[PDB]
Amino acid sequence: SEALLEICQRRHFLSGSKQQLSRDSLLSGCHPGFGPLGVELRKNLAAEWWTSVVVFREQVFPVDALHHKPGPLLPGDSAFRLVSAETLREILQDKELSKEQLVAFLENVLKTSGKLRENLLHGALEHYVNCLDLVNKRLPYGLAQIGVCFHPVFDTKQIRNGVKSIGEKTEASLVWFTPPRTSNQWLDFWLRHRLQWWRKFAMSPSNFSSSDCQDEEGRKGNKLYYNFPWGKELIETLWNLGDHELLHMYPGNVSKLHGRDGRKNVVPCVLSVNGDLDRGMLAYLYDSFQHRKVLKLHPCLAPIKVALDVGRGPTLELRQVCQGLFNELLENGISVWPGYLETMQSSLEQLYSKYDEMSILFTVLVTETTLENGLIHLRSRDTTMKEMMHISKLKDFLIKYISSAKNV
Amino acid sequence: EGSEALLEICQRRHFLSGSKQQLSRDSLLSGCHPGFGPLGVELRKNLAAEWWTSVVVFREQVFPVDALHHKPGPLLPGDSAFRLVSAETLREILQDKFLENVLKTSGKLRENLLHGALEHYVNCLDLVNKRLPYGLAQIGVCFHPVFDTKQIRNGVKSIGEKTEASLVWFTPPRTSNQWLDFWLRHRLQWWRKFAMSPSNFSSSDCQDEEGRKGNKLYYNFPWGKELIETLWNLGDHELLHMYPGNVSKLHGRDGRKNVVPCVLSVNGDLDRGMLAYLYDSFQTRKKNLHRKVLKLHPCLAPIKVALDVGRGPTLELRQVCQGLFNELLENGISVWPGYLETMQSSLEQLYSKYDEMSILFTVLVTETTLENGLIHLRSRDTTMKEMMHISKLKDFLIKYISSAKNV
Amino acid sequence: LSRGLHEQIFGQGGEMPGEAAVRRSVEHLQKHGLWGQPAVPLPDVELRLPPLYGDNLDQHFRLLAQKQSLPYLEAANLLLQAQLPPKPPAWAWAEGWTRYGPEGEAVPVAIPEERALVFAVAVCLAEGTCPTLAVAISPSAWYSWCSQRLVEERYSWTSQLSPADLIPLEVRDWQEQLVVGHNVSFDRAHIREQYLIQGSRMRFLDTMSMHMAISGLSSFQRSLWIAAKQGKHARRGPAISSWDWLDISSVNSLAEVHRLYVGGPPLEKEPRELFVKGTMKDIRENFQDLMQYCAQDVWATHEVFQQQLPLFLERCPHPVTLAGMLEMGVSYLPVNQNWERYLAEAQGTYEELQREMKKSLMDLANDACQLLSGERYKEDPWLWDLEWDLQEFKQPMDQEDLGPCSEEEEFQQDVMARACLQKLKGTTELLPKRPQHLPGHPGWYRKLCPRLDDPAWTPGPSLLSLQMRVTPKLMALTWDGFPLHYSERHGWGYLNDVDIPGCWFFKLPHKDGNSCNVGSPFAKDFLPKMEDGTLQAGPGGASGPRALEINKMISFWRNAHKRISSQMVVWLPRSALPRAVIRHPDYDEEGLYGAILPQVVTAGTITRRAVEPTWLTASNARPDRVGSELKAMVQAPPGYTLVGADVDSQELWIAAVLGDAHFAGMHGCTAFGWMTLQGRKSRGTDLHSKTATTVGISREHAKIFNYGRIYGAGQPFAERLLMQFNHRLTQQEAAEKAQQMYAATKGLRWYRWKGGTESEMFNKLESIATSDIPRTPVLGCCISRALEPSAVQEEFMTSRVNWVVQSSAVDYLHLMLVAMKWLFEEFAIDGRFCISIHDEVRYLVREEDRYRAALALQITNLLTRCMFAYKLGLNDLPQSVAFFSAVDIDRCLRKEVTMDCKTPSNPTGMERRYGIPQGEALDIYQIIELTK
DNA sequence: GATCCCGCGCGCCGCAGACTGTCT
RNA sequence: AGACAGUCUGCGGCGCGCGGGG
């Protein structure tokens, strides 16, 4: 809503000109990219998702999926986001027309050249055969990947011929092969884990919610929406697709795509989990905002943790201390905003408001008293409390704060 | 042969590269390979993390930026190589009644991410208070046109994908050359890092056809020298080209004077770097050693340690490794979830298997681990096994990785 | 005209050549060389010199030196005969300067308002380099300085505006000031006003410089003196049989100097060494004791100076010596921010290179451990004599399962495992046997990997270097043969198993090299001998090439990064810089402009040759050594540049002119000065590579021969040099003179003993050395009083004959310095600051007066050479000499205007100009600012 | 030349200081 | 059983050669 998109446009969370991004077109991918703060927030979210889903699970491996389909023997029925997929000159959906010999099935431009991927599931299905050997015919295992996908947009008033504008969405996908038996149990397990993960970083987890749905082909599915202020917008989907999707590929032969479970060969059942990392970022940004204007992003998700600054004292002999502290913090893996090299002192209140809008956990001020006795001023974003801390304990305090925030 | 042949073997087999019966160096270099295996993906991720830490971390005034894989169709001068065809074969003009035959006024897939950085320059100029010296870094996939230049069966040009890491550095014109030399020095320093034979990484100077200087970095694969990274002094040409309205908006403060920045573009191909490191890690004059092993650097090795349980009291007592597994998983130590093969295999084949995947250490838990807990710890670099401590394993691994990072 | 002599601006025809002298000279030239060798007449230039005071070119320099050195001599005399009160009871503990009046009363004072002082400074070596405390004595009172860092807080490492302040405000008589001290350069380095770009009217006297001037000693003399002073007591060892100099000589340390020049009780030496190896806290606790020790040192130095000044004046009567020493006591070296950058790069690259050297070796170790598994030490011909460490420390779920519940695992296993580990196996809990199975095939591979009690055992073998004697046999046949055997029974590679290079099959034991009387060491061969010498091999990778090359690349920086990267550099603030530096192009950049004081001893060795380990050394920017770019990064600030040059073959010309003057009154009398003047490579008879082809290996490889011969090298040195050349036999080499000694004394007495004859006149140098009277060579400076043959008679001839020429060169330098100071004083040439490296001289000068100063160094050189020739000679001088070949103008400091480097690999990018040497193009102007 | 340095590893000892079994 | 051999560790001196500059 108002007063939020402006704050995000400022402070370089969402890159673009005023009214370019707007509230609409952010759910779709047809908007200018994120700002550096937005990019860092997205990277943090992706890292947390990777930690929770891939490396701790002990059976989920990364998979490499290309951005484009090959093109030969391309079926004539598909979404066809970009029928070309060639270097340059994407011919978009290209529905209807192409009735002449030119640009026909012969050669490129008729569901012949190739298409850009719309989902990460197909790459996982392709790699499943080798990834079986990776886990040694152990049937229950998953393949995870975070990547960009391209989708077509429509509606948006009357444009005569549709522009099929390309929307880019950064999505995290997990394809979990499990015995067809007890597949619903794994569906419920993954649904619960994903809902808990999404609720973990939320200030108000009640906004995050789950709903159930049925499919003619898939057995059952679940959807997560988060209940944006204007309404509910689907942010994650879980589907029990079944084995027929996998059976469609590798149509020939049998007893090659099946795996061993309880020493019993069976064709696996695939669960597809797909979450929208960009929409998740937008949802978290809305959640953090709420009478000062402050974005209370989670400590594990905030792009910048601490901010350095200089107050009074000599211009020199403080820049060296600030540089030393900066180097120590980066050596210890803490992101810090180097505000010490700012030249217009401006105001303390304005400075604090600016850093609050940037969602910085702590504000650190170094003055001549730091040279005297090694004490720096520390302000907390959450409770706007100012205290004095020894400069040698800031790193340990920040690490402890981050660790405590990470735990329940 | 063993020269670029056995390297491809034990690469698809151990899931460092996608297995599609390719075994084609040209396909890997161009980007037509099906993909990378999980080990390859992890190695590339580690390399990207190291590049990010060395370039944008520990470097103030450098910020991240995201460039869309596509750009809007309108105002797209030029055309694709195969889209320009007007020689013959106009037999059917029977079609009745955008579209057309010349470029169709449509979008394109980016071949480089420098354009996005140049676009975001103006927006990102505010967060540095217009301090002209500053950079934008980004790692992303770029699409290029490649063809076998043989026969017509390939038909349209094939499309290759390459993961490129690019930094666009805006610098005052006066200091442009020195800053470029500094960057060329820091990239050559970083590529020689993690390398068992840094001499194989080399640098050369080149001149643009407009007279703009630049540098090229190469790795000496067994067949020859292949380009990996390129540095170019763009000379504020494209930046002015995209902004023809007024020059006031482009004015950044250098010292105490407002100037138009000069652009330096340092773009490296991460996939080729991964391939180069894989080749370098692998190794005949009175050798009589064999023992194939990928001696990758500890900082970017995909898997650090491997766990296993041998001749214990029972398979139910394996849980001692469980938790310890989790204990290693804390603080981000990647461990191979072994102790689940449950197949009677000779320990020599098992050790060779883990050697080929470039795992620094092999941990074996025996029946004597429940009391006076000692675990057989074998090292990749030398085939000697230690007992060491269960309690100190986490700290020992942390220390090993940290010391590898700094000499 | 005549024999290419210049136009005689000053002097008359009172001197006559002498017909007999002319006949003898031409007869000798015909006998040795060719009488008729016409040479192209050089262009003749006439310019109006400044008016020279006095007559005969000696009164001029005497008057200049006296005018320069009068105020400082007055100050020294004031300090000479001024008694002092006793030391105060208790030193004041306060910030700044305090003056101690009668009965110990202490009063705070801004700075000592005194004409002369004896000054000493102490620095807390443990932390930083800022001064801690200082004590000084004036003719009337004591002064103590306490640094602001006595309080507790954090301080920067920039070290600007911190050190002591000693120069009063110029804007109430005798503005000149003299500061006396033992190693006074160190104390001058810690003064505020000495780092200004503009000059100041303060000078420094070093008691150590005087000690080297009078009662000094050489390096061999130093070793003999130290041995004699020790309880107990090489190669030829001909004995001495003359030790009288022990009672008159001494070592440069303050204690020994005070003992020699004063018979008082020995100075008590503090054993705590709180300043060198103690924190600032113990300094605070031991304030009074340290202040007392510093005051004792100052008092001892004052006594030494009192006993030395009249003796020095007696033994160096010429005022020019004192004036030149005073001028050379003030050096300056602008650095700017790039210096810091250099300290980074030269460091980082060095570390990087070390890594490249280290990692490869580590691999060679690791792959060797695998030799343990096969039990095949005999298979390896290199490691079978190695230890090999024979010893060791000796210390299916077939169910679907899946879908866990929300419950959490009990875990609790790690705590129990840690308890069982720590509690049980008590033996290992203390002193754990880290080696276990690691030692392997390499000789105790555990040793190579750190012990780790403090190190933590960094990955792989990190205590592995190229000279452990383990690196050979780890790279196959790199060193000699299969065995290295650094101990007895060494590799017989010399400098098929016995004598024959390279050990194979273990033929004979013990030392059997029998080629150079020793063959124990390995590698250490400048010629690689890995292409054709053979006996070099390896498995591939950092073997042979890329092995010794890194070593030679980082050898210099290895034992240099301590002296370098620690020089006391002071960065001036913006307000301190002058008008010229500001409001000038360049400038700005948010850059630091600073200076380094070389800390140079004005007379640090026999003669009065200045000594500085980092700055006064002959080293160029070779494109193979990491730290080779030293002497660069000394670029002048904006609006300033370095103007100067070297004086060509100073030593050879001095020897030649001395020999000519001794033989006759001309400049080509002995056929050696003629060869030095009328000798060219292309046509003339050059001394090098010509007139000596009959001796040695052709024209080449003959420079060092003649250089050593004129520096005192004897016949056996030449025989040894020839023996290794062309593998000639000892019988083939002439034991007697024969081909050798043709230039030097060949006939010895030659009938008619003493006398050199032949091409070179060693008679003058030998006569001066063996005079037995205070030597007083050209310009009159006596010898160090310890190398004399009078009352000592030590027969250390190699030392005094070389002392003659070297002290003559130092006299030349003093004359150059005094002339330059006079020229800068008479004409308003800003930038009086100077730097000197033996013959090489440089001056920091403004760009506006750059060409006027470039014109200078030409009248200075002309007057210096005309004054040299005037003593025991006639005023006329060769035209070719008496004028510099070129005068460098480049902002930085380098051997030649055109440049090259190794570490940067592109140094022209960092705002480096060319240097535009002048040569003859600067001789089209007068030295008045009015003139153009 | 000049004999002479300092920064390495070998080595080759020595003597305290600590820990571990070891002896009576 | 308590007291005394070793092993290790600390640390000190002195030989051996090698390399920048005098």
Residue numbers in the entry:
A (entry chain C): 66 to 355, 368 to 485
B (entry chain B): 64 to 160, 170 to 355, 362 to 485
C (entry chain A): 79 to 249, 259 to 320, 336 to 497, 524 to 623, 740 to 996, 1049 to 1228
Can you list sentences taken from the study reporting this PDB entry?
DNA polymerase (DNAP) can correct errors in DNA during replication by proofreading, a process critical for cell viability. Here, we present an ensemble of nine high-resolution structures representing human mitochondrial DNA polymerase Gamma, Polγ, captured during consecutive proofreading steps. The exonuclease (exo) site is located ~35 Å away from the polymerase (pol) site, with no direct path between them. Altogether, our findings suggest a conserved ‘bolt-action’ mechanism of proofreading based on iterative cycles of DNAP translocation without dissociation from the DNA, facilitating primer transfer between catalytic sites.
Analysis of the Complex TWO dataset resulted in structures representing the consequent forward translocation of Polγ relative to the conformation observed in Structure II by one base pair (bp) (Structure III, “Mismatch Locking” complex) and by two bp (Structures IV, V and VI, “Guide Loop Engagement” complex). Alignment of the Polγ_B homodimers in Structures II and III reveals the next step of proofreading (Mismatch Locking complex, Structure III), where forward translocation of Polγ by one base pair along the DNA axis is observed. Polγ moves as a rigid body, not affecting the relative trajectory of the DNA (RMSD 0.8 Å for 1335 Cα atoms). Six bases of the template strand of DNA are seen to neatly fit within the binding cavity of Polγ_A between the fingers and thumb subdomains in the Mismatch Locking complex. The first unpaired template base (n + 1) is flipped out and partially stacks the mismatched base, assuming a “locking” conformation. The stacking interaction of the locking base with the mismatched base of the primer may prevent the premature fraying of the latter and its separation from the DNA template, ensuring timely entry to the exonuclease channel. The transition from the Mismatch Uncoupling to the Mismatch Locking complex requires forward translocation of Polγ by one bp without major conformational changes.
